[PDB]
Design a protein around this motif. Structure first.
Motif, PDB file in Angstrom:
ATOM      1  N   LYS A   1      -5.848   2.943 -10.893  1.00  9.13           N
ATOM      2  CA  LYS A   1      -5.222   3.999 -10.105  1.00  9.13           C
ATOM      3  C   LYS A   1      -6.216   4.526  -9.079  1.00  9.13           C
ATOM      4  O   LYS A   1      -7.398   4.674  -9.378  1.00  9.13           O
ATOM      5  CB  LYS A   1      -4.762   5.132 -11.020  1.00  9.13           C
ATOM      6  CG  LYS A   1      -3.639   4.740 -11.965  1.00  9.13           C
ATOM      7  CD  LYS A   1      -3.106   5.943 -12.724  1.00  9.13           C
ATOM      8  CE  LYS A   1      -1.862   5.585 -13.518  1.00  9.13           C
ATOM      9  NZ  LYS A   1      -1.265   6.778 -14.177  1.00  9.13           N
ATOM     10  N   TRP A   2      -5.732   4.809  -7.874  1.00  9.03           N
ATOM     11  CA  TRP A   2      -6.596   5.270  -6.789  1.00  9.03           C
ATOM     12  C   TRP A   2      -6.950   6.739  -6.971  1.00  9.03           C
ATOM     13  O   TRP A   2      -6.157   7.510  -7.511  1.00  9.03           O
ATOM     14  CB  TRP A   2      -5.908   5.080  -5.434  1.00  9.03           C
ATOM     15  CG  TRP A   2      -5.505   3.669  -5.162  1.00  9.03           C
ATOM     16  CD1 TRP A   2      -4.236   3.175  -5.091  1.00  9.03           C
ATOM     17  CD2 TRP A   2      -6.380   2.562  -4.941  1.00  9.03           C
ATOM     18  NE1 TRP A   2      -4.265   1.829  -4.832  1.00  9.03           N
ATOM     19  CE2 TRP A   2      -5.571   1.426  -4.736  1.00  9.03           C
ATOM     20  CE3 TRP A   2      -7.771   2.419  -4.893  1.00  9.03           C
ATOM     21  CZ2 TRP A   2      -6.107   0.163  -4.486  1.00  9.03           C
ATOM     22  CZ3 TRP A   2      -8.303   1.163  -4.646  1.00  9.03           C
ATOM     23  CH2 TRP A   2      -7.471   0.052  -4.445  1.00  9.03           C
TER      24      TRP A   2
ATOM     25  N   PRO B   1      -1.011  -3.630   1.815  1.00  5.41           N
ATOM     26  CA  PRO B   1       0.126  -4.224   1.132  1.00  5.41           C
ATOM     27  C   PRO B   1       0.102  -3.991  -0.372  1.00  5.41           C
ATOM     28  O   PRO B   1      -0.927  -4.203  -1.017  1.00  5.41           O
ATOM     29  CB  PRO B   1      -0.029  -5.713   1.437  1.00  5.41           C
ATOM     30  CG  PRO B   1      -1.496  -5.909   1.571  1.00  5.41           C
ATOM     31  CD  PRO B   1      -2.043  -4.633   2.138  1.00  5.41           C
ATOM     32  N   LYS B   2       1.233  -3.539  -0.911  1.00  5.74           N
ATOM     33  CA  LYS B   2       1.445  -3.503  -2.352  1.00  5.74           C
ATOM     34  C   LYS B   2       1.594  -4.942  -2.806  1.00  5.74           C
ATOM     35  O   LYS B   2       2.356  -5.704  -2.207  1.00  5.74           O
ATOM     36  CB  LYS B   2       2.707  -2.711  -2.702  1.00  5.74           C
ATOM     37  CG  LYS B   2       2.947  -2.545  -4.194  1.00  5.74           C
ATOM     38  CD  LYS B   2       4.274  -1.862  -4.474  1.00  5.74           C
ATOM     39  CE  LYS B   2       4.517  -1.730  -5.969  1.00  5.74           C
ATOM     40  NZ  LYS B   2       5.930  -1.385  -6.291  1.00  5.74           N
ATOM     41  N   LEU B   3       0.867  -5.316  -3.854  1.00  6.36           N
ATOM     42  CA  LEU B   3       0.853  -6.704  -4.302  1.00  6.36           C
ATOM     43  C   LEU B   3       0.523  -6.850  -5.780  1.00  6.36           C
ATOM     44  O   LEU B   3       0.020  -5.923  -6.420  1.00  6.36           O
ATOM     45  CB  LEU B   3      -0.140  -7.512  -3.460  1.00  6.36           C
ATOM     46  CG  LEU B   3      -1.583  -6.992  -3.382  1.00  6.36           C
ATOM     47  CD1 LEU B   3      -2.431  -7.481  -4.548  1.00  6.36           C
ATOM     48  CD2 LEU B   3      -2.219  -7.419  -2.069  1.00  6.36           C
ATOM     49  N   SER B   4       0.829  -8.030  -6.306  1.00  2.00           N
ATOM     50  CA  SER B   4       0.449  -8.412  -7.655  1.00  2.00           C
ATOM     51  C   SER B   4       0.021  -9.871  -7.622  1.00  2.00           C
ATOM     52  O   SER B   4       0.863 -10.768  -7.643  1.00  2.00           O
ATOM     53  CB  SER B   4       1.618  -8.218  -8.620  1.00  2.00           C
ATOM     54  OG  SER B   4       1.287  -8.682  -9.917  1.00  2.00           O
ATOM     55  N   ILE B   5      -1.288 -10.101  -7.557  1.00  4.76           N
ATOM     56  CA  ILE B   5      -1.824 -11.459  -7.445  1.00  4.76           C
ATOM     57  C   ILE B   5      -2.449 -11.929  -8.750  1.00  4.76           C
ATOM     58  O   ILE B   5      -3.131 -11.168  -9.436  1.00  4.76           O
ATOM     59  CB  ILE B   5      -2.851 -11.595  -6.300  1.00  4.76           C
ATOM     60  CG1 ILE B   5      -3.978 -10.562  -6.429  1.00  4.76           C
ATOM     61  CG2 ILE B   5      -2.145 -11.460  -4.959  1.00  4.76           C
ATOM     62  CD1 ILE B   5      -5.179 -10.864  -5.562  1.00  4.76           C
ATOM     63  N   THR B   6      -2.191 -13.189  -9.087  1.00  4.37           N
ATOM     64  CA  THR B   6      -2.742 -13.814 -10.277  1.00  4.37           C
ATOM     65  C   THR B   6      -3.504 -15.058  -9.854  1.00  4.37           C
ATOM     66  O   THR B   6      -2.977 -15.892  -9.120  1.00  4.37           O
ATOM     67  CB  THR B   6      -1.638 -14.216 -11.279  1.00  4.37           C
ATOM     68  OG1 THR B   6      -0.890 -15.325 -10.765  1.00  4.37           O
ATOM     69  CG2 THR B   6      -0.693 -13.049 -11.550  1.00  4.37           C
TER      70      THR B   6
ATOM     71  N   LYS C   1       0.148   4.084  -7.022  1.00  2.00           N
ATOM     72  CA  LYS C   1      -0.125   5.145  -7.999  1.00  2.00           C
ATOM     73  C   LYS C   1      -1.591   5.583  -8.002  1.00  2.00           C
ATOM     74  O   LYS C   1      -2.491   4.773  -7.773  1.00  2.00           O
ATOM     75  CB  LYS C   1       0.308   4.711  -9.403  1.00  2.00           C
ATOM     76  CG  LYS C   1       1.815   4.576  -9.554  1.00  2.00           C
ATOM     77  CD  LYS C   1       2.233   4.458 -11.010  1.00  2.00           C
ATOM     78  CE  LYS C   1       3.745   4.552 -11.155  1.00  2.00           C
ATOM     79  NZ  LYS C   1       4.177   4.558 -12.580  1.00  2.00           N
ATOM     80  N   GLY C   2      -1.816   6.872  -8.253  1.00  2.00           N
ATOM     81  CA  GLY C   2      -3.164   7.443  -8.261  1.00  2.00           C
ATOM     82  C   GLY C   2      -3.267   8.710  -9.095  1.00  2.00           C
ATOM     83  O   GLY C   2      -2.522   8.888 -10.059  1.00  2.00           O
TER      84      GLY C   2
END
Ligand SMILES: *[C@@H]1O[C@H](CO)[C@@H](O)[C@H](O)[C@H]1NC(C)=O
Length: 365
Positions: free
Chosen positions: A170-171, A266-271, A320-321
């Protein structure tokens, strides 16, 4: 912590290895966890196999004794895996040896003590049963996040290593969800990707580097960690990747002062999933995977090799933060992360790079 610059230089060599392989694929791994994995494995190995691992992990054996390395790694694992740690990451290493091999206790107990990892015994005769036992352990370990990691096992797999790591930080300064909207991500001159782009006007530790020819954003995570994003200028990604050295990263981290800016992130989800056998083989780690492997420290009855080594790193960058700020009157620069970018996650006190990666395409699962 004296092992940080080795992990840093290990990160860059490991990164540029992957950048050299594929031009247009997402890079994302954890050089800390990978190094930890094989620094832990270094206990089980001996002779040239032992020396080849550490030197491949960017450690000169004469400059830093192994006794001092292993505790150096333990200090990181202590810092990452804490009670009430707001880093909010679940890293874990799993060893999987075949039942029947008379294992050495010295190795097994040091895996649990010095490296807080856990070894298991499995029947590799049944391939599907083993596959499930590996992936269920990862599913267990990552609280259901990472699933079906090992896609295949060899018929004669005898000793399998698996190194997962998940991170959803979380930021300190959150982005607003209402501000987040759909925007174009220019992966290259032809491909364009609609991505949920987070965006906030505020004071960011962001500075346009002339040395790297890149916009360099730093964002503090909640808990002792920091995210450095490098947005290269038009056609300067190659230039950027080459110019990055630990001395340069530290030079940015120590810079505190901020600047008002209109950031699009960019909001992202990298694997990033990687067959370490293949990947580290390119870096120099080969003898542990070969037949003539000195794994007498693991088991001394029969000959052994590390038949499989897998690593999967998963990141979740979202808005989210945590739960004031004053902006100057000047017109802030609108720095858009809509084109491919490199980035690192650095642990604040140890300055060790937890993660490193390059986003080519955020939607690339
Ligand atoms: C880092 O964490 C330590 C405790 O582990 C805390 O005392 C310190 O204030 C933190 N610093 C930052 C910049 O988050």
């Amino acid at each position: 912590n004296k092992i940080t610059p080795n992990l840093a230089e290990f990160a860059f060599s490991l990164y540029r290895q992957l950048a050299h392989q594929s031009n247009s694929t997402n890079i994302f791994f954890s050089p800390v966890s990978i190094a930890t994995a094989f620094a832990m494995l270094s206990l089980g190995t001996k002779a040239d196999t032992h020396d080849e691992i550490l030197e491949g992990l960017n450690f000169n054996l004469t400059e830093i004794p192994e006794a001092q390395i292993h505790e150096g790694f333990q200090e990181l694992l202590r810092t990452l895996n804490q009670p009430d740690s707001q880093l909010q990451l679940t890293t874990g290493n799993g060893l999987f040896l075949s039942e029947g091999l008379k294992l050495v206790d010295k190795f097994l107990e040091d895996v649990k003590k010095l490296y807080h990892s856990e070894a298991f015994t499995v029947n590799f005769g049944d391939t599907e049963e083993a596959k499930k036992q590996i992936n269920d352990y990862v599913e267990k370990g990552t609280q259901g996040k990472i699933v079906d990691l090992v896609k295949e096992l060899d018929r004669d797999t005898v000793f399998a290593l698996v190194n997962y790591i998940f991170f959803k930080g979380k930021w300190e300064r959150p982005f607003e969800v209402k501000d987040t909207e759909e925007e174009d991500f220019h992966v290259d001159q032809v491909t364009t990707v609609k991505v949920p782009m987070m965006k906030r006007l505020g004071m960011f530790n962001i500075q346009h580097c002339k040395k790297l020819s890149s916009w360099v954003l730093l964002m503090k995570y909640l808990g002792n960690a920091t995210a450095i994003f490098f947005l290269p200028d038009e056609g300067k990604l190659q230039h950027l990747e080459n110019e990055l050295t630990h001395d340069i990263i530290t030079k940015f981290l120590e810079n505190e002062d901020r600047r008002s800016a209109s950031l699009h992130l960019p909001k992202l989800s990298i694997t990033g999933t990687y067959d370490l056998k293949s990947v580290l083989g390119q870096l120099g780690i080969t003898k542990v995977f070969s037949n003539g492997a000195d794994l007498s420290g693991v088991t001394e009855e029969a000959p052994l090799k590390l038949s499989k080594a897998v690593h999967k790193a998963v990141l979740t960058i979202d808005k989210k933060g945590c739960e004031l700020e004053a902006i100057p009157r000047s017109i802030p620069p609108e720095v858009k992360f809509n084109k491919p970018f490199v980035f690192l996650m650095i642990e604040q006190n140890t300055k060790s790079p937890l993660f490193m990666g390059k986003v080519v395409n955020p939607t690339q699962k």
